[PDB]
Write a protein that binds this ligand. Structure first.
Ligand SMILES: [Mg+2]
Ligand SMILES: [Zn+2]
Lengths: 60, 52, 47, 407, 42, 233, 55, 45, 55, 111, 115, 108, 259
């Protein structure tokens, strides 16, 4: 719903299981922990030179 | 992924905030709300409730 | 049902047109047997 | 005009000038075909409106296509039936394992503990019954399993029967095969497997009596009687059947089995008391049928034969206690009042289950006439007022009655 | 939701009406009661 | 327990007590607290309560005050039915405690639990336990096995004290208040249920030999045309 | 001028004695000493025993 | 036109009878209750 | 509307159940049976237990 | 669609046999293909979520519920399409609730 | 009670059964096999004899029902009551006659036994 | 004396279940697959359906003699006019006999 | 914890997540204050108590008037594990695995297909999960267990091809996961040392088997002395022999010796 709405934050529990799955979930080690996908800019398509390689003499 | 942030407290309680298309600043604010509240009671702010 | 009949539980009134339509239908059944027609029920759907 | 829906299935007032509908007497509602229409579906063959197409493909598939077998295949189907001896051995092994793995009931203090249900036992016992031709009562089996000594008796007898059948075969099957062969073209004594079988069936019947199911106890004793060919075993089984029928208020069968056990006296071993028990059952059946002099004569003959066995003595003392009061009240039991008073709770339960109630199950709700239910009017055994048989008339043949006003 | 029953104690019922000095409710208290003597002369 | 220290004998079930098995009661779903008033003319409700113990999700709390009341009213009661019922309840509870299916509240743990300086009896200790586990283990459904006529069934009008100014409606959920301060509010009654598990069969006793206004008319009524061979005066 | 009735107006009929005596009530019975069937005093069976000595 | 249907549908448990069963009756009841309680809190409490 | 419904019925075993007495007969029936000649109390006879000793 | 999974809708409705050829299998798009794995279920074990076989898990739940209801010491019977209005049937059931079998049968035969 | 209208039923009879010429020893605990057959008789009064005029009247009235026209009336009554909506009335194809040769023979044997 | 009776609110208000859009139950891929009624608590050891062919006599016995049912041997409407089946019956036919469609056999 | 799933249940049902519904949440049954319309404050203990205790009894609640199941019986918990092992590994697969293990001693694994290997692994996984879910009831009912079920405790593990841990093997290690993130919520009965508790349960059940055998032999000897005759039943002799063979065989299969 809209952010300026009462129905936006009316889900208080039940969204997340308290137990984490033992296959992909991990803990935050700290600032030096390189998180996959984390980027300062809003990137709706977070690709890099490996997933979407550029074909040019230099990287833009 | 579930666009929500959850906080699990020491008394076994949970508090979830919705973060769908919400700015990272708003996510930070709701995370600070989580770390600030204790999630043990819900009482009104009235004259008969100012003193616990 | 004695207490019910005493305290009037149920419709104090009753049907009035039946004690005559019954004999009318019996006479009609006599006429049908005369005319060699099969006898039918008086009220097939009004029941 | 039109104070509701427009479809014929709606529930409110309609009119012909605005919502004209064709005459639909009775049709299924919006959820499903109710019983009022399934009655027509099964009797008339279609719903009473005639607008519905009879679609019985599913029941056709369930009955006819399933029961259809080509003759060339059914000619060989019977040539591949499982071996009866191996089937009996496997069924006995499975039933014995399932009875042995039954847990022992824990005795609590202050209240009665619920016995564990016989869930994994109904199928092995079913195979055992269908392979041996004898039905076992589940209530009796549960009671035998609850009873610690009866459970041990049953286990020992079943193990003996298993060993005897696995080492020598099935003596009832041998007897039936030899009888059929002799009929196509004598009698041996009761074998060890037959002895173990009748012993375990007697244990089952004793457990069923301890439960309180006298009909099933008598039935188990009856189908166990078919496996004994020895005079001692037959006399014991007849005494048991007499006692079970006495408890079940089957006075006729009790008297018959008692006099059979009594007749088996000359060819029985002198140590057995089955003949004394048969005399006891006969006298008790007589006393329950209210033949006090007959019961006294029977118990006197039984005493003279057996000089005063404890059971006969107690029965004679009871009969004498009744005889010291019957002439003090009526000098005898009236002939038109014999076998009229209920004495046992078995017949009370039977009457509760299959009596005539107020409104239904009486001679005014529905009457049975050759496996067909009839209304109270169409009762061929009664011509009371309100029956259709009072409107027959002379049928244009001859004046049967001298009645002037009716018939 | 609360519910005040329609079957109430009536003045014509044999059970009758109560005396609030004898009743035992949550909103009645007789612990800190005191007795005063009022004189209506003049 | 999750922290494994190693990475970095015979087991026997003791007597179940509340303060030593708080961890067990939190995993348990429903907890029925027994009251001695239930043992009136029958023990069928106690039997139906102990029938739910082998379910693995139900527990039974019997207190020493309850046991003392049971023994007292088994030895001194104008009703032999009640005396027999209380003796049978004693033996049932003893069997359950010996087997380890019901939990016991000894007198030492009763001292440790009850609020300081407060006199307690069966009626007050029932609600003391109820308020304690309703405040500390909120995820456990608490029931009370009491008699329909028991005055302790409604604590906020019979067991409530005076007009105390140091208690409020939220005196049940604050960990610093005494346990019995919750008697003044209806929240204890809201969180605790009083249920009859399985009443004995509703079959009426034989009343043919009591006075019947419809059978009394036939006492002096003439019935000559009702009999043929056995006329009796 | 009638209007729809709420569930509480429907249940008020149960509070009366005319509703309970018609629907919610049991029978006083015993076993017929001759037929061993449940039986109410005052009514009897079609039987030469239960007609002479009607229990 | 907003009537807070989705917000007031959660509190039909606190009502009773036809207001708790049927949605429109319960919504009208809760709307009236909230409006009157707001009025009382504003100018009478 | 020809209405029909479904019916759920569960029978459970209760060893602690004590059924009331339903064999109590009225005084009228008692004295009528006495007048006829039948015993007021049902005749009970001890039946020896089932024994598998002869087999 | 560029890649159409078997359980997705496109110009069609949901049919169980068409959209779920094998209910124990779960299809997904791995490297622009239809890759099918064993469908699983998440269960709490030792404080974490663990993957168990979904088919075995459902079979186990079903068989356990059935065997518990079976070995429960009672007997339930559902008689459908009873020729009576449910209001009157509940009226008559209220008198028989909470009785014994003997008293129930007696009241039914005497009413 | 009568199921149709729930009316209370009453068995009315005469008292001196044994002092009567007719109905001497008749048993009314259960009706006869057919409504035209003689009523049941207790085993004790099997040798009883009835007045000859009443016996002849009953024999005539009973022989009235031994014809095939009565079987036709019976099936036609089945058809009429089935067309009139009365339930539990079988089809005139499924119905069977009340009186047949072998049944009449065994009933005659029983009547000669009861003399 | 008097048995406790209570009027049920389901007999006063019970609407229909929410239907499925595009015949899709939104949690088929999310919830386990257990037999209906098990997890809810609906269980039965024996189900006697009074609409079967073998229960006809029991149904007609439990019914009252006063209530009559007509058109037992005939029918008001002529039952020899050919007309189509119900939608679900036609769907059953189409789902069972699929080889009736033209060119259903695989070639070659 | 009341309505959703109990202590020994197998169904994982998150009470706050309505993943089994077919309709959006319209009405919340357990609500204390109207302010819970737009913020139910769920997750707080005192509110989730009222939210969860107002749920109707499901097939696992066994409501107060309805008769409950003797779930905490060892004589029920052991055949449950055996039926789990049976549903996991079929009969033909079990026979083939026994043949291969007797012929090559875990060396003929190349003969099995990948589907059968995955079936065995999934069966071991589900059996470990069920042992985890039944462990509290097992350790609670170990006192009054009977010899047949005590031996079935090993029979079920052998059928599921799970070698019980003693101080293939699947109960040897814990599920990997950091303690700072595991679900340590109270009220959710979940053991954390399974290789440590299953081992002590196995030791306890071995001691219980020894005690049951000694008690049975002592009772038989006392009965024989009271009868003053050496008349042992053939059924009892055969039963004693077969159980004495089966116990030692199935204990040696796991590695534990009865001493
Ligand atoms: Mg026409
Ligand atoms: Zn009678």
């Amino acid at each position: 719903s809209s952010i300026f709405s009462p129905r936006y934050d009316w889900r208080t529990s039940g969204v997340h299981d308290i137990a984490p799955r033992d296959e992909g979930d991990f803990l935050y080690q700290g600032p030096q922990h390189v998180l996959p996908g984390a980027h300062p800019l809003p990137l709706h398509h977070p690709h890099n030179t490996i997933t979407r390689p550029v074909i040019s003499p230099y990287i833009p | 992924p579930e666009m929500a942030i959850t906080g699990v407290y020491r008394d076994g309680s949970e508090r979830s905030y919705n973060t769908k298309n919400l700015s990272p600043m708003g996510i930070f604010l709701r995370l600070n709300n989580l770390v600030s509240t204790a999630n043990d009671y819900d009482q009104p702010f009235c004259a008969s409730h100012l003193h616990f | 049902s004695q207490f019910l009949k005493r305290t009037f539980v149920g419709g104090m009134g009753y049907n009035v047109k039946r004690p005559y339509r019954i004999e009318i239908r019996m006479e009609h059944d006599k006429k049908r047997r005369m005319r060699r027609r099969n006898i039918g029920c008086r009220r097939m759907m009004k029941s | 005009y039109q104070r509701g829906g427009w479809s014929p299935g709606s529930k409110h007032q309609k009119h012909m000038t605005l919502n004209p509908t064709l005459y639909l007497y009775r049709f299924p509602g919006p959820h499903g075909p109710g019983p009022y229409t399934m009655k027509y579906w099964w009797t008339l063959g279609c719903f009473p409106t005639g607008m519905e197409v009879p679609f019985r493909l599913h029941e056709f598939l369930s009955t006819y296509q399933q029961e259809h077998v080509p003759v060339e295949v059914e000619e060989w189907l019977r040539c591949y039936i499982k071996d009866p001896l191996s089937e009996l051995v496997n069924a006995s092994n499975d039933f014995f394992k399932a009875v042995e793995v039954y847990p022992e009931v824990e005795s609590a203090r202050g209240y009665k503990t619920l016995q564990p249900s016989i869930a994994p036992l109904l199928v092995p016992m079913k195979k055992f019954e269908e392979q041996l031709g004898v039905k076992i009562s589940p209530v009796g089996l549960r009671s035998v399993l609850s009873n610690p000594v009866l459970k041990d008796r049953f286990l020992d007898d079943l193990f003996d029967y298993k060993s005897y059948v696995e080492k020598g075969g099935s003596t009832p099957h041998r007897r039936l095969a030899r009888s059929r062969f002799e009929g196509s073209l004598p009698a041996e004594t009761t074998a060890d497997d037959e002895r173990s079988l009748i012993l375990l069936l007697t244990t089952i019947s004793e457990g069923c009596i301890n439960a309180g199911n006298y009909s099933d106890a008598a039935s188990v004793l009856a189908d166990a009687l078919m496996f004994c060919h020895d005079p001692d075993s037959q006399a014991t089984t007849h005494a048991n059947i007499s006692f079970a029928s006495l408890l079940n208020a089957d006075f006729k069968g009790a008297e018959y089995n008692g006099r059979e056990a009594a007749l088996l006296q000359p060819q029985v071993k002198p140590t057995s008391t089955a003949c004394a028990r048969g005399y006891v059952g006969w006298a008790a059946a007589a006393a329950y049928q209210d033949d006090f002099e007959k019961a006294e004569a029977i118990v006197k003959d039984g005493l003279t034969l057996y000089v005063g066995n404890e059971h006969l003595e107690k029965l004679a003392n009871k009969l004498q206690a009744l005889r010291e009061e019957q002439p003090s009240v009526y000098k005898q039991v009236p002939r038109s009042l014999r076998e009229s008073r209920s004495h046992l709770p078995s017949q009370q339960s039977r009457g509760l289950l299959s009596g005539s109630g107020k409104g239904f199950s009486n001679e005014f709700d529905w009457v049975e006439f050759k496996n067909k239910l009839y209304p109270s009017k169409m009762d061929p055994r009664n011509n009371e007022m309100g029956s259709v048989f009072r409107r027959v008339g002379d049928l244009g043949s001859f004046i049967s009655t001298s009645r002037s006003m009716e018939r | 939701a609360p519910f005040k029953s329609v079957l109430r104690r009536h003045k014509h019922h044999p059970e009758g009406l109560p005396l609030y000095n004898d009743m035992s409710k949550q909103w009645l208290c007789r612990e800190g009661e005191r007795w005063w003597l009022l004189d209506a002369r003049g | 327990n999750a922290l494994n220290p190693l990475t970095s004998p015979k087991l026997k079930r003791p007597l179940m007590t509340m303060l030593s098995q708080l961890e067990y009661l939190n995993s348990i779903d429903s907890v029925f607290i027994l009251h001695s008033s239930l043992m009136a003319t029958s023990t069928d409700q106690l039997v139906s309560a102990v029938r739910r113990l082998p379910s693995g999700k139900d527990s039974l709390i019997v207190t020493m005050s309850c046991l003392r009341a049971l023994s007292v009213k088994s030895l001194t009661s104008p009703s032999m039915k009640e005396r027999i019922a209380c003796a049978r309840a004693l033996e049932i509870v003893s069997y359950e405690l010996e087997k380890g299916r019901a939990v016991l509240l000894p007198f030492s743990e009763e001292i440790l639990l009850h609020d300081a300086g407060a006199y307690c009896d069966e009626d007050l200790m029932l609600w003391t336990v109820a308020a304690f586990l309703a405040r500390e283990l909120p995820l456990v459904k608490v029931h009370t096995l009491m008699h329909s006529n028991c005055t302790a069934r409604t604590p906020y009008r019979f067991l409530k004290g005076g007009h105390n100014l140091l208690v409020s409606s939220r005196s049940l959920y604050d960990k610093g208040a005494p346990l019995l301060s919750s008697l003044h509010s209806k929240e204890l009654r809201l969180v605790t249920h009083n249920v009859r598990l399985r009443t004995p069969v509703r079959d009426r006793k034989c009343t043919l030999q009591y006075y019947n206004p419809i059978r009394a008319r036939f006492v002096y009524r003439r019935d000559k045309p009702l009999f043929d061979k056995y006329h009796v005066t | 001028p009638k209007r729809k009735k709420n569930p509480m107006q429907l249940r008020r009929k149960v509070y009366g004695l005319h509703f309970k005596e018609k629907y919610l009530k049991m029978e006083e019975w015993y076993y017929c000493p001759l037929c061993a069937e449940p039986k109410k005093p005052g009514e009897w069976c079609r039987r030469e025993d239960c007609r002479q000595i009607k229990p | 036109h907003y009537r807070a249907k989705l917000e007031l549908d959660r509190i039909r448990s606190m009502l009773r009878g036809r207001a708790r069963l049927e949605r429109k009756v319960g919504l009208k009841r809760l709307f009236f209750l909230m409006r009157t309680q707001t009025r009382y809190r504003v100018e009478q409490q | 509307t020809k209405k029909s419904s479904h019916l759920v019925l569960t029978l459970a075993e209760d060893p602690e159940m004590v059924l009331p007495d339903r064999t109590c007969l009225p005084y009228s029936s008692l004295m009528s049976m006495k007048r006829a000649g039948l015993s007021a109390q049902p005749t009970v006879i001890d039946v020896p237990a089932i024994t598998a000793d002869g087999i | 669609p560029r890649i159409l999974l078997d359980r997705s809708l496109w110009k069609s409705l949901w049919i169980t046999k068409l959209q779920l050829p094998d209910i124990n299998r779960w299809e997904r798009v791995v490297n622009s293909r239809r890759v099918t794995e064993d469908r699983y279920a998440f269960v709490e074990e030792e404080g974490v979520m663990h993957k168990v076989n979904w088919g075995l898990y459902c079979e186990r739940l079903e068989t356990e519920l059935t065997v518990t209801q079976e070995r429960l010491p009672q007997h339930t019977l559902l008689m459908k399409a009873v020729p009576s209005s449910w209001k009157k049937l509940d009226i008559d059931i209220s008198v028989i609730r909470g009785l014994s079998l003997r008293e129930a049968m007696a009241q039914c035969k005497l009413s | 009670r009568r199921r149709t209208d729930a009316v209370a039923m009453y068995f009315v009879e005469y008292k001196n059964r044994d002092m009567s010429d007719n109905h001497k020893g008749e048993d009314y605990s259960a009706g006869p096999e057919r409504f035209f057959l003689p009523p049941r008789i207790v085993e004790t009064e099997k040798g009883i004899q009835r007045p000859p005029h009443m016996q002849m009247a009953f024999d005539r009235w009973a022989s009235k029902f031994k014809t095939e026209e009565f079987h036709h009336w019976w099936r036609l009554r089945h058809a009429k009551l089935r067309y009139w909506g009365v339930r539990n009335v079988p089809h005139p194809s499924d119905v069977d006659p009340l009186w047949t040769e072998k049944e009449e023979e065994e009933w005659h044997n029983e009547m000669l036994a009861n003399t | 004396m008097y048995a406790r009776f209570r009027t049920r609110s389901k007999f006063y208000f019970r609407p229909a279940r929410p239907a499925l859009a595009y015949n899709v139950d939104p949690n088929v891929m999310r919830r386990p697959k257990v037999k209906r009624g098990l997890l809810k608590g609906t269980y039965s050891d024996e189900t006697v359906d009074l609409r079967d062919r073998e229960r006809l006599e029991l149904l007609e016995s439990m019914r009252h003699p006063r209530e009559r049912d007509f058109y037992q041997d005939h029918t008001y409407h002529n039952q020899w006019l050919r007309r189509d089946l119900e939608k679900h019956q036609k769907q059953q036919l189409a789902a069972r006999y699929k080889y009736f469609a033209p060119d259903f056999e695989i070639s070659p | 914890v009341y309505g959703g799933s109990g202590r020994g249940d197998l169904l994982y049902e998150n009470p706050d997540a309505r993943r089994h519904s077919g309709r959006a949440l319209g009405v919340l049954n357990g609500v204390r204050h109207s302010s819970q319309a737009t913020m139910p404050e769920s997750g707080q203990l005192y509110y989730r108590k009222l939210i969860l205790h107002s749920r109707p009894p499901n097939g696992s609640c066994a409501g107060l008037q309805r008769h409950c199941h003797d779930t905490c019986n060892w004589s029920y918990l052991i055949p449950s594990l055996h039926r789990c092992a049976e549903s996991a590994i079929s009969a033909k697969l079990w026979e083939k695995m026994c043949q291969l293990g007797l012929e090559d001693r875990s060396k003929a694994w190349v003969n099995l297909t990948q589907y059968e290997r995955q079936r065995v692994r999934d069966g071991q996984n589900l059996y470990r999960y069920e042992v985890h879910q039944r462990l509290p009831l097992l350790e609670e009912s170990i006192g009054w267990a009977q010899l047949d079920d005590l031996l079935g405790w090993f029979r079920s593990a052998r059928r599921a091809w799970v070698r019980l841990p003693t101080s293939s093997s699947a109960m040897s290690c814990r599920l990997e996961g950091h303690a700072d993130s595991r679900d340590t919520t109270p009220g959710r009965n979940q053991v954390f040392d399974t290789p440590e508790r299953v081992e002590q349960l196995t030791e306890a059940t071995v001691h219980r088997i020894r005690e049951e055998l000694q008690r049975l032999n002592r009772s038989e000897r006392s009965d024989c002395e009271g009868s003053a005759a050496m008349r042992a039943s053939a059924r009892r002799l055969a039963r004693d022999e077969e159980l004495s063979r089966c116990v030692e065989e199935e204990l040696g299969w796991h590695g534990v010796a009865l001493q």
